[PDB]
Amino acid sequence: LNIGKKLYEGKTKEVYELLDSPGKVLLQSKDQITAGNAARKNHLEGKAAISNKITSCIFQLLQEAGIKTAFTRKCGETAFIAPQCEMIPIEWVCRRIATGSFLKRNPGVKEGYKFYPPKVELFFKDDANNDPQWSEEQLIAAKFCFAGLLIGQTEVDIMSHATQAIFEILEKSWLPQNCTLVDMKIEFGVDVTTKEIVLADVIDNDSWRLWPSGDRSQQKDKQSYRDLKEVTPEGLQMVKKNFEWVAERVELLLKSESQCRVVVLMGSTSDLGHCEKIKKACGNFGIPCELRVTSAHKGPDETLRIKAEYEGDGIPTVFVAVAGRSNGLGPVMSGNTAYPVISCPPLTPDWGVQDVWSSLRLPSGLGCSTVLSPEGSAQFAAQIFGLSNHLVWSKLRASILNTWISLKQADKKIRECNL
Amino acid sequence: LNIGKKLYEGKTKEVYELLDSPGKVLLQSKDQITAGNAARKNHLEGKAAISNKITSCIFQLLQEAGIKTAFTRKCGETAFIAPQCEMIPIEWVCRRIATGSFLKRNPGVKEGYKFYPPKVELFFKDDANNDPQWSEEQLIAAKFCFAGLLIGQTEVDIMSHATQAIFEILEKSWLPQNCTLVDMKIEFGVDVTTKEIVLADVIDNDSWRLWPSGDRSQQKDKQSYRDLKEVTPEGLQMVKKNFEWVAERVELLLKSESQCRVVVLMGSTSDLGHCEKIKKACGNFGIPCELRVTSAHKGPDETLRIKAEYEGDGIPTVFVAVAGRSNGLGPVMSGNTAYPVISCPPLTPDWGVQDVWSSLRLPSGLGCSTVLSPEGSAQFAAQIFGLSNHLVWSKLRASILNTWISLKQADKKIRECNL
Amino acid sequence: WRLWPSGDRSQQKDKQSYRDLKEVTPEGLQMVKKNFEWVAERVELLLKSESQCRVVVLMGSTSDLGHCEKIKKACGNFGIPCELRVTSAHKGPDETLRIKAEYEGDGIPTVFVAVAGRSNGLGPVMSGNTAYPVISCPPLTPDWGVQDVWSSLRLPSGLGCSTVLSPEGSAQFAAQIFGLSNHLVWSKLRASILNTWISLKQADKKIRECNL
Ligand SMILES: Nc1ncnc2c1ncn2[C@@H]1O[C@H](COP(=O)(O)OP(=O)(O)NP(=O)(O)O)[C@@H](O)[C@H]1O
Ligand SMILES: Nc1ncnc2c1ncn2[C@@H]1O[C@H](COP(=O)(O)OP(=O)(O)NP(=O)(O)O)[C@@H](O)[C@H]1O
Ligand SMILES: Nc1c(C(=O)N[C@@H](CC(=O)O)C(=O)O)ncn1[C@@H]1O[C@H](COP(=O)(O)O)[C@@H](O)[C@H]1O
Ligand SMILES: Nc1c(C(=O)N[C@@H](CC(=O)O)C(=O)O)ncn1[C@@H]1O[C@H](COP(=O)(O)O)[C@@H](O)[C@H]1O
Ligand SMILES: [Mg+2]
Ligand SMILES: [Mg+2]
Ligand SMILES: [Mg+2]
Ligand SMILES: [Mg+2]
């Protein structure tokens, strides 16, 4: 590992150039904890390893969901490799629950006020003035430029939407551990190579407020250190145990709590191309997808036996029925399983207007749903599993963001061809 | 409570007439455990309370799912009130896993062979000949008559289907406790008042095989007592602890592990009638259902804020979009949530052929599904929640049985109008 | 097997007659032999068609010949003779009735299949003037097929004319009709249900390998 010059150093991290890696840097954590802009600073042994472990797990989680993130890989106990960014000097905060500075700036609001949707705020980075709140209008008027990207209305709107999405993903991911994510702070930078705005810096135990069972008095985050009247050695051991508590649970956010499976049943091997599109699209949400050939019309006995194989092994299953012309496979399956059935018929413009009604108009006592897009039927199957699986949910959530970002970028492009 | 005369007494239960309660009886459990046809009999203190508690919990579970069952209520620690039945003298067994007598009657099959779907078998009740297996053809040819109901092809086909459905419901219900329901035995009788075939006798720790983590050596059922080489006082305490283990956990089968909610969003209060039908049908599955008024066309800002309230409180939610004419509410919602959205448009024959396409043909990146039936949209919502909620699943499964039974009954009726 | 003439076990012609003998005598073996000879004589009649079958495909235009060739080919698969005839109900209704009469009049059980594009009058006219079954199998394309099909489907009262869109399907339906009387046609239909089912099982087995 070919380490170059120390680029900068701050309160908790040293950033080094990597001579064998163009556009990449090494972020080495220090055994330092800090708070405020006064003398609250301490050595804390093992903090560097805890910060590194949390950020490395959280960045891998957000990256596997599809959030664009400045993270390459973990590099031992106390560092990580990242794409080099020109950091935007704004703290982006997201709140589910009103506490901390929100109450000070909004006297009359009580602790516990819930934000639907989560509240996003901006703070300009400046220790001299204790990080003052900025409006979107102030950030636009600053006309900041980083690695050649002017930070305008489009870029601010993107960081704002991304902050909400990142919060919701981390919020949903902590829920299975019976922890309430109250709020968080993140920072973005411009990747010096790609010129993309990406989540950067770290997300660690100083970034958020984490309340087991929603109970503030059980707070496990750095607020436990900020709240101390006086820092004693007995006080720092409590803080360290809180950081250890989070370090011991954070890797479980990468694990699937519940199993998911899509079974695509096709009446004919001529509709294989259409079923390959469903299977591929399921792969994008990390949901295993099996293809099976069975006809309701010509082998209804075999359809029910295949159904029984998937009903009988304890794995939650969504069936997707692909039947051309008069669809009996969706209906028959729908009538004989408690699991959901989606008809995704391979309609063409020739007879599709006529064929679709055999999926849509069903006798009473049948729940069978219809989705015409094959990518759509995978997404709907994912949305169903997202109710139980935070990993699938997070891919859906990040995909809503990324698609929205794509529209903003295409509008920005075509707007330049308006002069 | 006015107790009458003792009607019957067997190895483990006494049946008493209730003088104020026509067509109901009291089944009093005894502190007796037995095995085989031979001298394996023991007094075991608290067995009566454990048997009564298990059957009372299991019968309430099956009854609340919609399985027709001879159970009224628990009546203290050691008895229960039931509708009086003329018992059909057949033991109905269902197997997920090959063990016990299946291996003896099918040499070459290995322990652990899985049945898809679960295997149903009939045994005629006769201690003299160790309960010989009967075919369906033998039971039909017996021309049994109980409380005036001749047991024919229809009645046998009903008991056989009911046995599979009861087993699958109990199998699904034990899964969240990490217990494998291997197999079970049940008996049916004819309710002397209604003349309906109903599950009767008991389902207790003698009725099934229960393997924690699928591990036969951790068996918690009465097989632990059958297997003992010789019955010692130390041997009976181990059996008692197995029965106590089941007694403790059986009550958790009545508890919902996961929360469910349907939110029905309507573009106009003129579509209220249609939304009332969705809400009523959701009530049948025990799923709370909220009605909300919002227009994507006229109040899209408000649609997103309402969406956020239900996204934000940690409760798994299915949205049902009810918009007449050009449905924008399904699409908009679908594009802005990771939760499932179902369009259930209030189509009439006037313009329904034209309006439906606004739900069906969507831009890429939308998983929005379509269900035309309002009862159907609730059932689909139930099927989605049934992947996580064994109580919802069980109502869907019992509904498949009951619907099938009522077709058999209607066919039997119209067949009389053909002679 | 066990073979009972008139469903009468006491007339059993199979080897059960030999299994049942208390003791095997020379007189006992001659009775068994006669039972075997009875079956030997009659087994050859199982290969013979008891009833005659014919499909007549009437086409309004020789441009629909391709579509009629598919009906005739598919009829050949069931061992049913199939004749093609050209007649228009619109332009030669007198001739349509005379052609109908040739096939009504020679004692051979016949199913008529009417192939008329656009406004199908040939199915209806034929249906109204014969006691034999008529099937409309119109040569629909996606251009105007949604509009044309209704001329086969919505008929005045007193017409039994049926519709089958598939040309192979119209032959199979014709076969099913003859299968009520002809055990050879029936047996091809029955074996075809098996073979189709077997090939689904085989295709499912193949695609299951592409899932591990
Ligand atoms: N991917 C990245 N590429 C380049 N610089 C980065 C990246 N991630 C973080 N940094 C910078 O690394 C510097 C050192 O971090 P740290 O020691 O935590 O600083 P600090 O004292 O918190 N300073 P500041 O964040 O500016 O208030 C920070 O100033 C970040 O802007
Ligand atoms: N709902 C009911 N109504 C009437 N009788 C019932 C009902 N449920 C169970 N019984 C009968 O109650 C009797 C006493 O049960 P039990 O003490 O378990 O007898 P047993 O020794 O197991 N006899 P058996 O089931 O006939 O082999 C049995 O004969 C059952 O058929
Ligand atoms: N961690 C930080 C910081 C911040 O600068 N923190 C450090 C400075 C440093 O990390 O070196 C400190 O002084 O404690 N600013 C916001 N937040 C987080 O943002 C949400 C809202 O915080 P509020 O605005 O209510 O104080 C909560 O989760 C904080 O943890
Ligand atoms: N409990 C019984 C009985 C039965 O008669 N039980 C009692 C009779 C009595 O109450 O004295 C006993 O002797 O243990 N028959 C079937 N089963 C259950 O049904 C499935 C079939 O078991 P198999 O046929 O493999 O033994 C397994 O779950 C048994 O527990
Ligand atoms: Mg700050
Ligand atoms: Mg920092
Ligand atoms: Mg038994
Ligand atoms: Mg009993």
UniProtKB/Swiss-Prot annotation, chain C:
The modification Phosphoserine is found at residue 61. Disulfide bonds: none annotated. Residues 48-53 are annotated as: Linker. Residues 54-212 are annotated as: AIR carboxylase domain. CO2 binds at residue 119. The modification N6-acetyllysine is found at residue 34. The modification Phosphothreonine is found at residue 25. Bifunctional phosphoribosylaminoimidazole carboxylase and phosphoribosylaminoimidazole succinocarboxamide synthetase catalyzing two reactions of the de novo purine biosynthetic pathway. It is linked to Phosphoribosylaminoimidazole carboxylase deficiency: An autosomal recessive inborn error of purine metabolism, clinically characterized by multiple congenital anomalies and early neonatal death. In the N-terminal section; belongs to the SAICAR synthetase family. Homooctamer. This is Bifunctional phosphoribosylaminoimidazole carboxylase/phosphoribosylaminoimidazole succinocarboxamide synthetase. The gene is PAICS. The chain holds residues 214 to 425 of 425 of the full protein.
